[PDB]
Every structure is written in C-alpha cells, then in structure tokens.
Amino acid sequence: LNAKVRLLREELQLLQEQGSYVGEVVRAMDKKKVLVKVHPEGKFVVDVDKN
C-alpha cells in the first residue's frame, strides 16, 4: 500500500514534461503529413504519431 502511494508520486514525475502546443488542422495530406496552424504563429507541416 505504501509502495502504491509513493509510486503515484513517481508517476507525478510526468508533470515535469513540457506541454505540447495546441493547434487547429487546416487540412491533411498523405504520408503522415498534416498542415496545422499554430495558435499564435503560422502554418506548420507536422509528422503524425503512430497512435
């Protein structure tokens, strides 16, 4: 039981990782490429994740 609570804190090491930007997809193209505009910047072609 003590291991579980400390493991939850070990899981909290995840909070350290930086958040990914939030953007809107203008359109999609083939070969795992999508055209997404960044919220305060400009159009970015991005590589899609396996998931």
Partner 1 sequence: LERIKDYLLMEEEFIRNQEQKQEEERSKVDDLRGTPMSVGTLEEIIDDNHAIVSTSVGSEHYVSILSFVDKDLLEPGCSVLLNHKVHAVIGVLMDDTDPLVTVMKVEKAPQETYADIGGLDNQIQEIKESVELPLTHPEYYEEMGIKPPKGVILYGPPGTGKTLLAKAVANQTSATFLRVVGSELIQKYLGDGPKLVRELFRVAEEHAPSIVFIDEIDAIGTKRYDSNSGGEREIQRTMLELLNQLDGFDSRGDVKVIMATNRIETLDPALIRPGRIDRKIEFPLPDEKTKKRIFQIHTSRMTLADDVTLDDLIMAKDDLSGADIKAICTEAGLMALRERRMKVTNEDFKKSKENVLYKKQEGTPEGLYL
β 33-38/23-29 pair status: antiparallel
Residue window 1-40: x/- pattern of binding to partner 1, with contact defined by CB under 8 A: -------------------------xx---x---x-----
Judged by DSSP in three states, 28 sits in: strand
Rounded Cα gap, residues 30 and 33, in angstroms:
6
Q: Is 49 in the site for partner 1 (CB under 8 A)?
A: no
Cβ atoms of residues 23 and 36 within 8 Å: yes
Q: Is 45 in the site for partner 1 (CB under 8 A)?
A: yes
Q: Give the residue, chosen from 10, 11, 17, 47, that forms a contact with partner 1 under the rule CB under 8 A.
A: 47
Footprint of partner 1 on this chain (CB under 8 A)?
Answer: 26-27, 31, 35, 41-47
